[PDB]
Design a binder for this molecule. Structure first.
Ligand SMILES: Cc1cc2nc3c(=O)[nH]c(=O)nc-3n(C[C@H](O)[C@H](O)[C@H](O)COP(=O)(O)OP(=O)(O)OC[C@H]3O[C@@H](n4cnc5c(N)ncnc54)[C@H](O)[C@@H]3O)c2cc1C
Ligand SMILES: *[C@@H]1O[C@H](CO)[C@@H](O[C@@H]2O[C@H](CO)[C@@H](O)[C@H](O)[C@H]2NC(C)=O)[C@H](O)[C@H]1NC(C)=O
Ligand SMILES: CC1(C)OCc2cc([C@@H](O)C#N)ccc2O1
Ligand SMILES: *[C@@H]1O[C@H](CO)[C@@H](O)[C@H](O)[C@H]1NC(C)=O
Ligand SMILES: *[C@@H]1O[C@H](CO)[C@@H](O)[C@H](O)[C@H]1NC(C)=O
Ligand SMILES: *[C@@H]1O[C@H](CO)[C@@H](O)[C@H](O)[C@H]1NC(C)=O
Ligand SMILES: *[C@@H]1O[C@H](CO)[C@@H](O)[C@H](O)[C@H]1NC(C)=O
Ligand SMILES: *[C@@H]1O[C@H](CO)[C@@H](O)[C@H](O)[C@H]1NC(C)=O
Length: 514
């Protein structure tokens, strides 16, 4: 595990403005998106080969509130001016949401919770994983940016609550996604310093890795044995640039659940009838590009203790197969955190509150990413998740809400009631309280008060768009590595999986080429 230490910006020595035309040329690999998967992928490929990493955002030093736990709220409260690290969107379902626009991707703006994948996930996928190498690669990530959290009073209250509510067993401190209650890792260190995927660029070879920032990749270029041969990208001034791969080298899209399918569709990889309807020339028909896009529901209550509670980062997890639960203790604010609640029309907290949360696994409900512009990658795509379209998801939310009621009735949580009465009506709530306990009362609560967990995934799935080598089927020299790749969450908190996956696939590419 990592130690408490400053955020390591050594890598800025090989970070350049995309306005620099001397970056245009031929590389062994081009990685699109300097994010959770892309940064460890590019660093790994750079051990042997010449790599260009292209990121649309700027460097995290421009937005210092991205570098502390205390700055998390600021990034979500900040107005989206096109340049900020948080890009705001609303799904077609009407649920507010965010994605990252910054070198380091979503590991620069996220809640810092670190977990390994459920060890059963690898067999569930039917991919031939090198499991020894998966674990070596988890340790490579953890040694860089993961700490054992110190005790925080509220996380300890919630952990005692989860155990008293029957979320057993007590796993103590563990990075593994296992049934029961545990202290997990964090990418915040014990001084509140954020550590993130950009720091994994410090593991790259500085003679072989180049990083362009404010590089908006608009199009994947193809041969005229269809192969990806390069990219077009625009700089902050609006000027265009090209970069190519050479010989046995490859383009990898790491632009996230939203950005990957967007760029594939803009580049003519996707459903023939849809792309022909936009007069986008089809290079490779695949009816699944932008399909099977998922967002795990977040359902929640907010309690307002009569005495102040200490603000905390999330470190204590209550895991069952059918729901994943945490709680944050949150300082009050008068400017909303965009997407913390599902719409801007949510009450503001006047005092410290506990946000007590359950996540639906999978989920089984899915939707799609479609283009909003047939030409401009800077124009956000349309995204729809179809929350609770699958009844199994709704049943799982009912089970999770019953368990949050159990948590609120524990001796652990009793001291946080406003009134010493028998029920959970003894708490004071911000927003809608929990349930009458008939299925319809819990289903109404689940459906009406859903928010994003921010763990959306899918849109370029293995088994639909990709093979088990993460290659785009029917195309040479093109791969996809990021959260677009799997339909079900690997665990409650997937950044650890996707950090591992960038390096893992980098190591597979290097091996396939030897
Ligand atoms: C608010 C929030 C809180 C979260 N908290 C947690 C948590 O505590 N723990 C956890 O495990 N997970 C958490 N997650 C989820 C997790 O961080 C993400 O699922 C994961 O980081 C996604 O990784 P990715 O590589 O797919 O995408 P990203 O990290 O978003 O990387 C994609 C990158 O591509 C860039 N890009 C996109 N399009 C282009 C383009 N055309 N050209 C160039 N660059 C482009 C983007 O700017 C970005 O930097 C959180 C998510 C959010 C949004
Ligand atoms: C870890 O992943 C495994 C495999 O996906 C899960 O096991 C499955 O769980 C469902 C229960 O909802 C069962 O119907 C399947 O039979 C299980 N598969 C196997 C291989 O046993 C497991 O639930 C996940 N664990 C947690 C804690 O999330
Ligand atoms: C504002 C506040 C309390 O802070 C951080 C936070 C983290 C999580 C986490 O599980 C994820 N992802 C859920 C909710 C949440 O809300
Ligand atoms: C962590 O903060 C403490 C103060 O509580 C200090 O003693 C220690 O040197 C700090 N380490 C850092 C900032 O790296
Ligand atoms: C890149 O250069 C342009 C001016 O050419 C400037 O406006 C922009 O801020 C620079 N971007 C970064 C990320 O340095
Ligand atoms: C990998 O690590 C997990 C714990 O994260 C462990 O349970 C598993 O046995 C390890 N697998 C291999 C192949 O060593
Ligand atoms: C596609 O181009 C044809 C002309 O070739 C035109 O008739 C049609 O309306 C166009 N469709 C779109 C959506 O641009
Ligand atoms: C729910 O999801 C599963 C597929 O994972 C499927 O068997 C079932 O048909 C789905 N229900 C609906 C309404 O789609």
């Amino acid at each position: 595990l990592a130690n408490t230490s400053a955020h390591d910006f050594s890598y800025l020595k090989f970070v350049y403005n995309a306005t620099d035309t001397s970056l245009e040329g031929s590389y062994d690999y081009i990685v699109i998106g300097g994010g959770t998967s892309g940064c460890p992928l590019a660093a790994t490929l750079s051990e042997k080969y010449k790599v260009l990493l292209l990121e649309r955002g700027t460097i995290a030093t421009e937005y210092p509130n991205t570098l502390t736990a205390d700055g998390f709220a600021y990034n979500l409260q900040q107005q989206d001016d096109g340049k900020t690290p948080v890009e705001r969107f609303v799904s077609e379902d009407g649920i507010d949401n965010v994605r990252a626009r910054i070198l380091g991707g979503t590991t620069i703006i996220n809640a810092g919770v670190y977990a390994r994948a459920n060890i059963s996930f690898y067999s569930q996928t039917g991919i031939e994983w090198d499991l020894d190498l998966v674990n070596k690669t988890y340790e490579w990530v953890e040694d860089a940016i993961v700490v054992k959290p110190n005790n925080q009073s509220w996380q300890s209250v919630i952990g005692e609550g989860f155990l008293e509510a029957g979320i057993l067993p007590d796993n103590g401190f563990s990075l593994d996604h296992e049934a029961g209650t545990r202290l997990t890792g964090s990418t915040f260190d014990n001084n509140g310093t954020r550590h993130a995927a950009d720091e994994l660029l410090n593991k790259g070879d500085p003679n072989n890795l180049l990083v362009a920032v404010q590089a908006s990749v608009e199009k994947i270029l193809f041969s005229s044995n269809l192969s990806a041969i390069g990219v077009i990208y625009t700089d902050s001034d609006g000027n265009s640039h090209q970069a190519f791969v050479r010989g046995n080298g490859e383009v990898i899209v790491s632009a996230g659940t939203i950005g990957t399918p967007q760029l594939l569709l803009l580049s003519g990889v996707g459903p023939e009838s849809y792309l022909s309807s936009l007069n986008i020339t089809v290079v490779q028909p695949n009816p699944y590009v932008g399909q099977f896009v998922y967002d795990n529901p977040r359902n929640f209550i907010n309690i307002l203790p009569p005495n102040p509670i200490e603000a905390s980062v999330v470190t204590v997890l209550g895991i069952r197969s059918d729901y994943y639960q945490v709680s944050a203790s949150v300082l009050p604010f008068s400017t909303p955190l965009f997407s913390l609640f599902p719409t801007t029309s949510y009450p503001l907290p006047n005092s410290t509150f506990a946000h007590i949360v359950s996540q639906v696994p999978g989920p089984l409900s899915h939707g799609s990413v479609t283009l909003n512009s047939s030409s401009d990658v800077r124009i956000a795509p349309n995204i729809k998740f179809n929350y609770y379209s699958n009844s199994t998801d709704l049943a799982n939310c009912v089970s999770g809400m019953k368990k949050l009621g159990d948590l609120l009735r524990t001796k652990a949580l009793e001291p946080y009631k406003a009134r010493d009465v028998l029920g959970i009506d003894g708490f004071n709530y911000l927003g809608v309280p929990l349930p009458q306990t008939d299925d319809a009362s819990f289903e109404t609560f689940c459906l009406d008060n859903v928010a994003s967990y921010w763990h959306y995934h899918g849109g370029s799935l293995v088994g639909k768009v990709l093979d088990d080598s993460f290659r785009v089927m029917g195309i040479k020299a093109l791969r996809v590595v990021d959260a677009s790749t799997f339909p079900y969450e690997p665990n409650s908190h997937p950044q650890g999986f996707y950090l591992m996956l960038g390096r893992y696939v980098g190591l597979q590419i290097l091996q396939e080429r030897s």
